[PDB]
Design a protein around this motif. Structure first.
Motif, PDB file in Angstrom:
ATOM      1  N   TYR A 259       0.515  -1.432   0.148  1.00  0.00           N
ATOM      2  CA  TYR A 259       0.034   0.249   0.347  1.00  0.00           C
ATOM      3  C   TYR A 259       0.765   1.305   0.085  1.00  0.00           C
ATOM      4  O   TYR A 259       0.515   2.415  -0.305  1.00  0.00           O
TER       5      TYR A 259
ATOM      6  N   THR B 120       1.825   1.726  -3.584  1.00  0.00           N
ATOM      7  CA  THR B 120       1.137   2.021  -5.449  1.00  0.00           C
ATOM      8  C   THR B 120       0.981   3.818  -4.106  1.00  0.00           C
ATOM      9  O   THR B 120       1.056   4.249  -5.213  1.00  0.00           O
TER      10      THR B 120
ATOM     11  N   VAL C 121      -4.859   2.163   1.037  1.00  0.00           N
ATOM     12  CA  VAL C 121      -4.095   3.411  -0.084  1.00  0.00           C
ATOM     13  C   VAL C 121      -4.839   4.867   0.699  1.00  0.00           C
ATOM     14  O   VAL C 121      -4.915   5.695   0.777  1.00  0.00           O
TER      15      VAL C 121
ATOM     16  N   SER D  68      -5.123   1.445  -8.229  1.00  0.00           N
ATOM     17  CA  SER D  68      -4.876   0.967  -7.586  1.00  0.00           C
ATOM     18  C   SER D  68      -5.699  -0.585  -7.560  1.00  0.00           C
ATOM     19  O   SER D  68      -6.930  -0.101  -7.380  1.00  0.00           O
TER      20      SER D  68
ATOM     21  N   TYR E 134      -1.219  -4.693  -2.756  1.00  0.00           N
ATOM     22  CA  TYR E 134      -1.592  -4.170  -4.057  1.00  0.00           C
ATOM     23  C   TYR E 134      -1.253  -4.095  -4.997  1.00  0.00           C
ATOM     24  O   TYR E 134       0.265  -4.840  -4.496  1.00  0.00           O
TER      25      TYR E 134
ATOM     26  N   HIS F 165      -0.046  -1.497  -8.879  1.00  0.00           N
ATOM     27  CA  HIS F 165       0.032  -0.107  -9.135  1.00  0.00           C
ATOM     28  C   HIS F 165      -0.422  -1.015 -10.794  1.00  0.00           C
ATOM     29  O   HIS F 165       0.129  -1.064 -11.016  1.00  0.00           O
TER      30      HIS F 165
END
Ligand SMILES: [Cl-]
Ligand SMILES: [Cl-]
Ligand SMILES: [Cl-]
Ligand SMILES: [Cl-]
Ligand code: NA
Ligand code: NA
Ligand SMILES: [Zn+2]
Ligand SMILES: [Zn+2]
Lengths: 312, 312
Positions: free
Chosen positions: B109, B112, B162, B259, B270, B272
């Protein structure tokens, strides 16, 4: 040969291998180490692994310089390093709770500028100024003073102008929200309103008195006849009122700080006056207190937030 | 005994003389040296003249901490130092032109979030974040990551969110100019307009599609009946559209970055996605390119400046 790092911001480092028999100039061009010009110096064993400043001569360094200093003039870094060699030798004493500068190299205009910045709400945009000003307030203002000189295209020793210096600094500050609306009343032409934003909204040249600016000042109309200009609305954390030096009385509790200039363009000297519990004249490293003050004032700063006139 | 410096920002240094037989804790309280907790360590000859971080236990240090970090929570510095001990050990490789983070301690997290910040217009206010983010973009993001954790009251290893992390960061950013006006149309209650500013103006939870946000989304009225909410005007450098994770198709050239979250609150991860010449999935240190992409998207960022609707 040895391995060093070249940089334009002391953060983005580029590895280099230099021949110990050639000068740093033949290899890097203009080169600086801890603010000293080493362009004509040949590499030494004690230089290994150290970081050197260089002029941005490739596009990667140019972008890094622009991101850090917010300028594209490639010679900026050289002007900054040259000034820094001297400002590192200046003294930055704490006077009346503020970082001042002991007099040197005709630097009185820089000291009153620095003293002023510590008394008004102002945030800088360029990372270089953000970092140097934070250290300046901590008493290590060599880099900040050297940056000012570089941004103003002034060299150490040159006589400076505070209003012009503040103008350069304000351009690199966040004055987005600042707004000023003025009204000029010519009994022949009528009412003509104008709106200013940014630095134009905080700086005015012609009168030191913010209150007189609100009541109205006599200024020629565009037609040439004498008219009246008064403040309609102001939205700013502060205002800078300037005028050509002339004898002027600073009343305690009616302003924030002011600049006094004695002399002319070939030789002169600035002093800083600030309104605390009593008027205090900060003169570089010197300090004087007085119940009242009068002198050749040229800039006066006042705190603001929101003002709307009452004139119809 | 030896002379050291204590600090809360590594810029304002305070001289101290410590007894080599007592721990730094008995003298300073919680103490850190280069991110290592030395509270129970007794001074050593090799510590002379070095700089130590301490918790702000007097009013001078509290003000310095507040000026540097923009927080008054005294334990912030300890949370920051504790996280920093770990983040210094992380790797911050350059992936697809951006500073990412090699996976460690459930830090997807943070990666990203960092990747996102490098693709939208955002300026931080706290000096600590200004300095750490500039270094982060240069590939030295340990301090920046440790600051994020401290600001979010998260410890290293904790699974993070995020959207909640971006929310904390946005509060410490300059979103003054940002403005959003929305209209909710309930054919029983009528039109009800609202105006949002700051972080509320850039973040929205409920739909990933900025275009659908402009056309109108179905959301319950205050009366409970189903109504329609659509974007009336936006003034921002970017907008963050979020929604609970669900399968979603990211079209090339129609967004900036997004995300993806796979898993749940006890275990997840996560990734990206960014739209460049083609879609690129930055997965910490891993990189994958694809013409198209679909997955459990939860945040999508779009560039903006000024939008005014056409709906009557
Ligand atoms: Cl410093
Ligand atoms: Cl004032
Ligand atoms: Cl660094
Ligand atoms: Cl976009
Ligand atoms: Na200030
Ligand atoms: Na950015
Ligand atoms: Zn006229
Ligand atoms: Zn309703």
């Amino acid at each position: 040969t040895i391995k060093v790092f070249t940089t334009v911001d002391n953060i983005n480092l580029h590895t280099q291998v230099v021949d110990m028999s050639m000068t740093y100039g033949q290899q890097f061009g203009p080169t600086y180490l801890d603010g000293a010009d080493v362009t004509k110096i040949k590499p030494h064993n004690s230089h290994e692994g150290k970081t050197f400043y260089v002029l941005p001569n490739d596009d990667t360094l140019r972008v890094e310089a622009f991101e850090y200093y917010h300028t594209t003039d490639p010679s900026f870094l050289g002007r900054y390093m040259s000034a820094l060699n001297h400002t590192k030798k200046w003294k930055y004493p704490q006077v009346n709770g503020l970082t001042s500068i002991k007099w040197a190299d005709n630097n009185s205009y820089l000291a009153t500028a620095l003293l002023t910045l510590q008394q008004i709400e102002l945030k800088f945009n360029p990372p270089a100024l953000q970092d140097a000003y934070y250290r300046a307030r901590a008493g290590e203002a060599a880099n900040f003073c050297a940056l000012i000189l570089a941004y103003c295209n002034k060299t150490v020793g040159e006589l400076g102008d505070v209003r012009e210096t503040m103008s350069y600094l304000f351009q690199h500050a966040n004055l987005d929200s600042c707004k000023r609306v003025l009204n000029v009343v010519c009994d022949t032409c009528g009412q003509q309103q104008t709106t200013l934003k940014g630095v134009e909204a905080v700086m005015y040249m012609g009168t030191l008195s913010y209150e007189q600016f609100k009541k109205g000042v006599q200024i020629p109309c565009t037609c040439g006849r004498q008219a009246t200009k008064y403040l309609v609305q102001q939205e700013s954390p502060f205002v800078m009122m300037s005028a050509p030096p002339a004898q002027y009385e600073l009343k305690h509790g009616t302003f924030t700080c002011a600049s006094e200039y004695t002399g002319n363009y070939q030789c002169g000297h600035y002093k800083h006056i600030t309104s605390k519990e009593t008027l205090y004249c900060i003169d570089g490293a010197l300090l004087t207190k007085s119940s009242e003050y009068k002198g050749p004032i040229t800039d006066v700063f006042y705190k603001e937030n929101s003002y709307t006139t009452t004139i119809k």
